Amino acid sequence: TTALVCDNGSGLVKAGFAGDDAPRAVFPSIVGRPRDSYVGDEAQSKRGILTLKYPIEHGIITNWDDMEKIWHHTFYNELRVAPEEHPTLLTEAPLNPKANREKMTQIMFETFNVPAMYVAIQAVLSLYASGRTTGIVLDSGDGVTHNVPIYEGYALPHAIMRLDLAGRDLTDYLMKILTERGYSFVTTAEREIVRDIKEKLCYVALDFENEMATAASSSSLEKSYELPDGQVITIGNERFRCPETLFQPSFIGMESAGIHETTYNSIMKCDIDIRKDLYANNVMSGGTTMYPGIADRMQKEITALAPSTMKIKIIAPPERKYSVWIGGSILASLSTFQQMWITKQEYDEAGPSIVHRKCF
Ligand SMILES: Nc1ncnc2c1ncn2[C@@H]1O[C@H](COP(=O)(O)OP(=O)(O)OP(=O)(O)O)[C@@H](O)[C@H]1O
Ligand SMILES: [Ca+2]
């Protein structure tokens, strides 16, 4: 019997089979009901006649009925499996409450009748995907950014940092600044294009000011882009200005500190002991960390932030968009992991609190 790895995100569901090198299903974490309900991409196209909702906010599940619907659709329509024949690894946000996590367990067992499940912290899986059990994870997704410092495979809860700004915000901002340029991107259809420009053409500048200086001088940083109506459009300084929001959340009117600073502050909240280890083990995770240049930029910013003698390293795996899912695939496939599943039997005996004595 194969295991299913199912990574729930604010914006995207990543789901598939343990042992695969990537998720078979990737789709909007969206439920739509009329103004008898619809999931993912169907929900989006039919948004004119539905109330679209997000069951996961900032990585935390907040609407249980819609989450149930998401999972149903995942098992039955996306992966086309019988959930009662498959151990299921689910993933969770950092600092997910005990009540939440227990509720996930109950639903799997009572609603979906799985024979076994597990719940693993997403940052741990990412860090595990990179062959590490110690380090600090920057997980930037669609709806939230976390810094998660992990030591010997255990996340340090007092040092976790949250920044309420990620992918969907960068998309909205890119819409906004392209519209300043002279285009118009206001409509949902137009949001999807901006999303595609963003993932294709954006990048983090090594020195921000210096980049504006180059961009206000020549075409050397401009790129063309062809639209779905056939129109070609020039995009210039908007390429590095959009992802710069990650370092300067004040660009979208946010008081919060940037990702370099939140990373730094996270490490600062840890033992001197292990602070040295975290610095040489910054691992970047999630769709929003995909920008070219992101590695070097973070590299630089931590260097100027941290003691001058300190050795610092940033790890950006090519596949880090699904590296949480991948970590799950490796984990759920291991010889030794097989003893860690919470079986339906163990659940009937213990109840949902059993879920907490995990290692991941
Ligand atoms: N090449 C890319 N460059 C920049 N952003 C990207 C790229 N590919 C995907 N993204 C963005 O990453 C986000 C989705 O990533 P991910 O699945 O890691 O987040 P999530 O798990 O859905 O949300 P969260 O982690 O906040 O709950 C989307 O906003 C998407 O636009
Ligand atoms: Ca995520």
Q: Write the DSSP string, 237-290.
A: THHHHHHHTTT-GGGGT--SPPHHHHHHHHHHTS-HHHHHHHHTTEEEESGGG-
Choose the residue to mutate in 12, 203, 240 for probing ligand 1, maximizing ligand atoms within 8 Å of C-beta.
12
User: CA 267 to CA 279: how far, in whole Å?
Assistant: 8
Residues within 5 Å of ion ligand 2 by Cβ? 9, 141
Distance between Cα 321 and ligand 1 center (Å): 7
DSSP classification of residue 306: S
Q: Residue 350, Cα to own-chain centre: how many angstroms? A: 32
Task: Give me the amino acid identity at 104.
Answer: M
**Ligand 1 atom at minimum distance from 122 CA:** 25
* Cα–Cα separations (whole angstroms), residue 8 to 98, 104, 113, 117, 142: 17, 11, 19, 15, 11
Contacts of 354 (CB under 8 A, 6+ apart): 105, 342, 346, 347
The sheet with strand 31-34 has its strands ordered as: 38-39, 31-34, 50-53
Give residue numbers after which the chain breaks (C–N above 2.5 Å). Answer: 35
User: CA 39 to CA 33: how far, in whole Å?
Assistant: 9
CB burial of 38-57 (b: ≥16 within 10 Å; e: otherwise) equals bbbebbbeeeeebeebbbbe
Strands (E), the chain: 4-8, 12-17, 25-28, 31-34, 38-39, 50-53, 56-57, 60-61, 88-92, 116-121, 135-140, 145-151, 154-155, 161-163, 223-226, 232-235, 282-285, 314-315, 342-343
Choose the residue to mutate in 174, 288, 289 for probing ligand 1, maximizing ligand atoms within 8 Å of C-beta.
288
Cβ–Cβ < 8 Å for 182, 281: no
**Ligand 1 atom at minimum distance from 170 CA:** 29
What is the structure's resolution, reported in angstroms to one decimal? 2.7
The domains found in the chain, sorted by start residue, are 1-122+324-360 (3.30.420.40), 123-164+257-323 (3.30.420.40), 165-256 (3.90.640.10)
User: CA 225 to CA 232: how far, in whole Å?
Assistant: 5
Cβ–Cβ < 8 Å for 149, 156: yes
Tokens of 77: 């329509």
Among protein residues, the one with the nearest Cα to ligand 1's atom 9 is 287
